[PDB]
Amino acid sequence: MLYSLARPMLFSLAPERAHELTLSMLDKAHKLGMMRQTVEAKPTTCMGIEFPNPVGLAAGLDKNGAHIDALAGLGFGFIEIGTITPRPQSGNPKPRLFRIPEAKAIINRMGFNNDGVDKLIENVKASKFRGILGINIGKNADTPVEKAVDDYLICLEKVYNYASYITVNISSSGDALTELLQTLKARQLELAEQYNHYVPLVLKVAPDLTAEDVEFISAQLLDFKIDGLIVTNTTLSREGVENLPYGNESGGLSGAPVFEKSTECLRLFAQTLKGQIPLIGVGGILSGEQAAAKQQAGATLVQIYSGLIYTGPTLVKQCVEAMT
Numbered sequence: 347m348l349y350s351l352a353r354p355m356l357f358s359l360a361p362e363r364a365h366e367l368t369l370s371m372l373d374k375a376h377k378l379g380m381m382r383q384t385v386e387a388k389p390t391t392c393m394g395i396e397f398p399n400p401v402g403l404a405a406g407l408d409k410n411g412a413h414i415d416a417l418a419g420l421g422f423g424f425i426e427i428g429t430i431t432p433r434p435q436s437g438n439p440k441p442r443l444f445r446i447p448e449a450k451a452i453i454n455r456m457g458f459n460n461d462g463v464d465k466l467i468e469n470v471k472a473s474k475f476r477g478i479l480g481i482n483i484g485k486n487a488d489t490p491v492e493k494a495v496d497d498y499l500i501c502l503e504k505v506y507n508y509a510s511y512i513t514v515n516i517s518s519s520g521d522a523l524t525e526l527l528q529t530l531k532a533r534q535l536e537l538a539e540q541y542n543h544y545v546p547l548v549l550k551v552a553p554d555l556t557a558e559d560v561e562f563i564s565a566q567l568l569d570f571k572i573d574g575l576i577v578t579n580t581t582l583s584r585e586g587v588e589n590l591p592y593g594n595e596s597g598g599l600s601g602a603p604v605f606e607k608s609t610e611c612l613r614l615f616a617q618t619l620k621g622q623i624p625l626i627g628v629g630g631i632l633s634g635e636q637a638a639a640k641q642q643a644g645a646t647l648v649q650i651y652s653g654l655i656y657t658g659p660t661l662v663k664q665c666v667e668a669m670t
């Protein structure tokens with residue numbers, strides 16, 4: 347109720363200001379004993395993890411892990427924080443977040459703004475949440491290309507003992523992916539021995555992929571025994587927003603206009619992987635019906651983000667109800 351009642355006022359504000367205000371008010375309402383949402387039990391076992399329900403928070407909403415307890419109170423089966431980088435960085439210049447309400451869409455070029463991995467870990471330590479926490483790790487913008495792998499390694503080591511699973515986003519070039527996965531997988535196996543427990547590694551792709559891309563990525567997932575695949579991140583397409591304000595802004599498009607492309611990408615990977623690697627369906631979930639559609643296209647879990655801006659927090663409850 348609270349969000350949907352405040353939304354007309356908040357939509358009168360610039361998007362990033364409204365975004366930060368909403369998270370701040372969520373935190374305070376949580377501390378006041380408010381914004382607690384009951385969601386149905388739908389136990390789902392995936393990647394060796396017992397999820398209480400199959401609806402997660404996608405990365406990029408809580409980039410620093412500063413809002414975990416308040417977001418957990420919304421009833422997510424799992425929460426993904428990040429993307430986090432080894433050092434803090436500002437991201438791109440503002441404005442960098444655009445609302446396209448007639449299409450129930452968002453365009454962002456945030457640029458991986460974050461407080462750095464040490465601060466994220468302090469935030470996690472101070473949170474009360476003990477459920478399923480995904481941590482999405484990345485590289486600093488100012489790291490030389492030849493040293494990029496080592497930024498992922500720094501984050502991997504620093505978050506290993508705090509994460510339920512770790513996500514790495516991959517770019518569409520093939521040599522670079524293979525080298526990164528070889529190094530990260532070898533290190534993950536070393537850390538699992540050192541810490542006496544296995545933390546699954548999940549890759550996340552964009553939807554703007556050719557058939558050859560899907561085949562290549564699928565082969566890599568299998569060769570390196572990657573534990574799961576998130577399909578998908580935002581799209582470079584502007585289909586569905588070309589005739590609306592902000593529809594020509596550079597960045598990634600999310601919300602309703604990415605539902606069909608992200609779901610088809612999920613379908614293609616599902617056909618290639620043939621049940622061998624769990625799929626996490628993300629993109630354009632604005633109603634529970636869309637979460638069920640991801641599951642029918644092959645997803646075991648889903649994640650939501652942009653639908654929280656439009657439908658609001660009750661979307662968590664709707665998605666759990668709708669999934670089989």
Ligand SMILES: Cc1cc2nc3c(=O)[nH]c(=O)nc-3n(C[C@H](O)[C@H](O)[C@H](O)COP(=O)(O)O)c2cc1C
Pocket residue numbers: 404405406407409428429443452454456458482515550578579580600601602604628629630631649650651652653
């Ligand atoms: C403002 C904004 C910031 C995002 N930042 C991240 C990020 O830091 N890491 C990441 O993997 N995905 C990030 N995403 C992508 C979302 O996790 C998700 O894959 C995409 O938005 C599609 O889902 P949706 O249409 O339900 O929002 C971001 C999305 C938005 C809208």
Ligand SMILES: Cc1cc(Nc2ccc(S(F)(F)(F)(F)F)cc2)n2ccnc2n1
Pocket residue numbers: 349353356357360361362364365366368369372420443444445452654655658659
């Ligand atoms: C009014 C508004 C809000 C918003 N972000 C947002 C952040 C958190 C939540 S929630 F309520 F997580 F529980 F706190 F769901 C909902 C929405 N954005 C983003 C771009 N424009 C926006 N306008």
Ligand SMILES: O=C(O)c1cc(=O)[nH]c(=O)[nH]1
Pocket residue numbers: 406429454455456457458459515579580598
């Ligand atoms: O920080 C960002 O710009 C960002 C990260 C990401 O993975 N996806 C996205 O759409 N934006």
